[PDB]
Each structure stands twice: as C-alpha cells, then as structure tokens.
Specification:
Keywords: TIM Barrel, Isomerase, TPI
Entry title: Crystal structure of Triosephosphate Isomerase from Streptomyces coelicolor
PDB class: isomerase
Distance between the termini of chain A: 21 Å
Number of helices of chain A: 13
Number of domains of chain A: 1
Chains A, B: Triosephosphate isomerase
Helix content of chain A: 40-55%
Order of helices and strands of chain A: EHHEHEHEHHEHHHEHHEHEH
Assembly: dimeric
Oligomer: homodimer
Strand order of the largest sheet of chain A: 7-6-5-4-3-2-1-8
Shape of chain A: globular
Strand content of chain A: 5-15%
Radius of gyration of chain A: 17 Å
Number of strands of chain A: 8
CATH superfamily of chain A: Aldolase class I
C-alpha cells in the first residue's frame, strides 16, 4: 500500500533564519520510526529554499522540501517567476500547484495549473495538485463533479509514466477558513471519487499508487479519523505546519 | 543624482550560477565604476540568500534586490514572498509592476500601489515599473497612460518615502513589434514623469528621484540613452545576464 505523505505548507511565513530553526526543531523532535513510516515534507517560501537545502544536506536530514508554486515556463522574460530548473538545482522534491489561494488571488486556471503540472514533471519535480470546490458547488451537490473535472484539467496531456507519482491534495474550500467542517466521510467521498477519476484517466494499477492528500484544516484532533480513511494518503497542512509540536503530532497521526 | 544600473535577470540563473555571475561581475569592476554609478542585480527569490552571503562575505559594493514583493506582510498567501523575508536577506531594491507581471499576473495600479507601500514598510526601495503597450502609443496617448500609471502607483505615499523611489519606464510598444524606442522617445517620457512627480510632491523632490529607462538597453545604445538629461539609469534586461555587456553599460561613458 501507499506511503502516506505529510506536507507542511508554511505559506508566506518564516524568513531564512526561522526556516533553518524550524526545520532543525522538526529534526530534533522526529525519530527514525517517524521517517520509516510516513513521508515528511515542508513547502517553504522560495527565499528559504537554499537555507533549507544546505541544512538538509548538512545535517543529513530525512525531511523533504518543496516549493509553493512554479512557473509554467523553463526560463526567460518572466519577471518575478521561478522556473523548474531553479527549484531542481535547490533539489526540491515537491511543488504545490494550483493551491486554492493562487486560484483565487492570482486567477490560476485549470489550463495554467495544468501547464505548471507539466513544467514540474519536465523538471524532475513532483507536483501536489491542489483541487477542491467552493461553497456554491457543495450546495449544488456537484462538488465531486467539479473536483473531478479540476483533477482532469490539471492532469491534461500527462503521460501515465509521470502521473504514476503525482500527488493530489483535496482542499474543501467550502470548509477550511470556515465554521463548516468537512468530516472524513465527506473527504473520503471526494478522495475516493478522485482515485476513481484517475482510474478512468489511467488505470486502477496507477490509481492505487497515487497519494491523495486531504487539504482541509488538519490538526492533532482531526488527523486520526481523516487518516484512517482508505483513500486518504496524507495531508497538505496549513497553519499547523508552522507549529513544531503540532506538525510532529500530525506526522504521528498514530496518536 | 547617482545613476542606477539594475540588472533584471528575470527568470534566469540558479543559485550557483547566480554566485558565479556576481563573482564575474565584481572581478570585472573597479572602484571608479561604483564611485560614479550604483550597481544592482535583481535576482530570482531562490538566488537571494546565495547572493547575500557572497556580498556579505566578500564585502562587495554591488547591491541586489527582488523582482517582486507581496503586498502583504505575511500570512496565508501561498507562493508569495514578503517584505520581512526580503528584508532579512538584506535586499536593497524590489521591482514592482513590471510589464511582465502586469501582463501575465493581472497586476493593476491598485495592486502595484500596495506593493510599493509594502516595500517601504520594510525598508526596501521600490523600483516602480511603468509604461504603455502598442495601442496607447499608436493613439499618441503614451505619456497620458504612463503618467496615470505613476500617479496610481504612488498614491498615499508621503514625501519622505517617495523621495527615494525609483521609476522605470518600459516602452512595451517596442518589444516584439519591430518598432524601435529611440533615446529621443524615452527622454520625453522620463521628462514628463519628473514633471508629474513635481506636481504630486515638489520640484525639489522630483529632482531627487531616479528615473530609469526599462526598454531594450545594449552596450551599443547605453551612452546615447544616458546622455539624456532626465534618464538616470537603466533597468537592464537580457544584457544584465551578460557580464561583459552589463559591465560596459555600467561604464556607459565609454
């Protein structure tokens, strides 16, 4: 079965010194039994990736790191953008792509995200395809249908030999910064459908290898029921990824 | 006004190539170069720590900066980079509202104005990029549009901040059109720009603000451009990636 992946998304937090400290903290608190059973990753601000790489290389940490975004292009006249080759030279493993914040604040489209998905693979990175429906879609009872299309759009023209290693993170945008909670049954339902949609686009042999993360509000209280689910293989953690003790707990969803 | 040559790498150079660049750069430059001209490189986020350690290590006179900044000070803004982050890396500058981000990332005068304030909030110096595309130039309204871009960008910025701001004019009508922007064309705008700054603040202030040319700048054209009375530097594109041609530009007098 699938090795679960716990990715801490720092968002726009931590300077390069704080990044160094926080990752040290994590390495202090985690033990061999932790890395043996669960995959641990931190997605750090661009400006922090060099500091995290030298530390990760320096103290030989088992913690993975990745970016929070990537340019669809390989290089060139794209002011402010960070390319696949740049993230690769810093030896990032992952890159969150299509995070709900970027679909909203920066008008990222399925077409744009798909391109970023492809740029990631072209460049030896593993994309974390962030998908999810807002409130209106959930009220319409079409949530899976929308999420299932988003996964397909994001995965457009992607060969199975790449897709086999992809990560999908489901963000129930209707229920994260929201008093409405998305229970594990609700997320299991989408994450099941997602694996079901992947089966159609590819093969059940592939679909069972793809880690599907939960991207709602994940805390120590939540993490157990969510994880028990048969088609949830990890979590893309928000605010709690910034708290050393709470991230370490999540990595041990085995409360 | 100390002229400012800011090398905009755009989406180029990994962290070790970046270091090699700046090493190449410092190797080719002498004290008389920095004495007359301010030298800066605007590098990808991921290169900034590497450049800082090199510049802090070898006590270089070359400055470095970012190609973007988030309007926010921190928070749930995935993928964006904040002032405090750029501030810790000891950046000097940050480009804001570059035509590429205005085109590809729907950055508005309103979004651009917010980055300018954020830049100042955290002890960075913004380089506010302004300019018109083809239609505004053919309509003969380029100056009108560019100037609206400058006023919008600088809204609610007090004189003690704006007096250190840098403006870069990008002739967007002359990238990929086959049309050339002469030094004659650019001087006119940078002139208008300084005139607008004078209204919004004072002539005394307006005379302290460096206004760059952000069009195509080569070793061949750099002298003619700089000899214009209201151009105080260049926001260099592709040639900024070329150590030799960038060193010539910094030495535009030759």
């Amino acid at each position: 079965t699938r090795t679960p992946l716990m990715a801490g998304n720092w968002k726009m937090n931590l300077n390069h010194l704080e990044a160094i400290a926080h990752v040290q903290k994590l390495a202090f608190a985690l033990a061999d039994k932790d890395y043996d059973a669960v995959e641990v990753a931190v997605l750090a601000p661009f400006t922090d990736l060099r500091s995290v790489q030298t530390l990760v290389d320096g103290d030989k940490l088992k913690i993975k790191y990745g970016a929070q975004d990537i340019s669809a292009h390989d290089g060139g006249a794209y002011t402010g953008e960070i390319s696949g080759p740049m993230l690769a030279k810093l030896k990032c493993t992952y890159v969150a792509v299509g995070h709900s914040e970027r679909r909203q604040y920066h008008a990222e489209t399925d077409e744009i995200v798909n391109a970023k998905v492809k740029a990631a693979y072209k460049h030896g990175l593993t994309p974390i395809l962030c998908v999810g429906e807002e409130l209106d879609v959930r009220e319409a009872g079409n949530h899976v249908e929308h999420t299932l299309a988003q996964v397909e759009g994001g995965l457009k023209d992607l060969a199975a030999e790449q897709a086999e290693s992809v990560v999908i993170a489901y963000e129930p945008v209707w229920a994260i910064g929201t008093g409405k909670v998305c229970g594990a049954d609700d997320a299991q339902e989408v994450c099941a459908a997602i694996r079901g949609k992947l089966a159609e686009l590819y093969s059940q042999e592939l679909a069972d290898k793809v880690r599907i993360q939960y991207g709602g509000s994940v805390k120590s209280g939540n993490v157990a029921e969510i994880m028990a689910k048969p088609d949830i293989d990890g979590a893309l953690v928000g605010g709690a990824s910034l708290d050393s003790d709470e991230f370490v707990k999540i990595v041990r969803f085995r409360d």
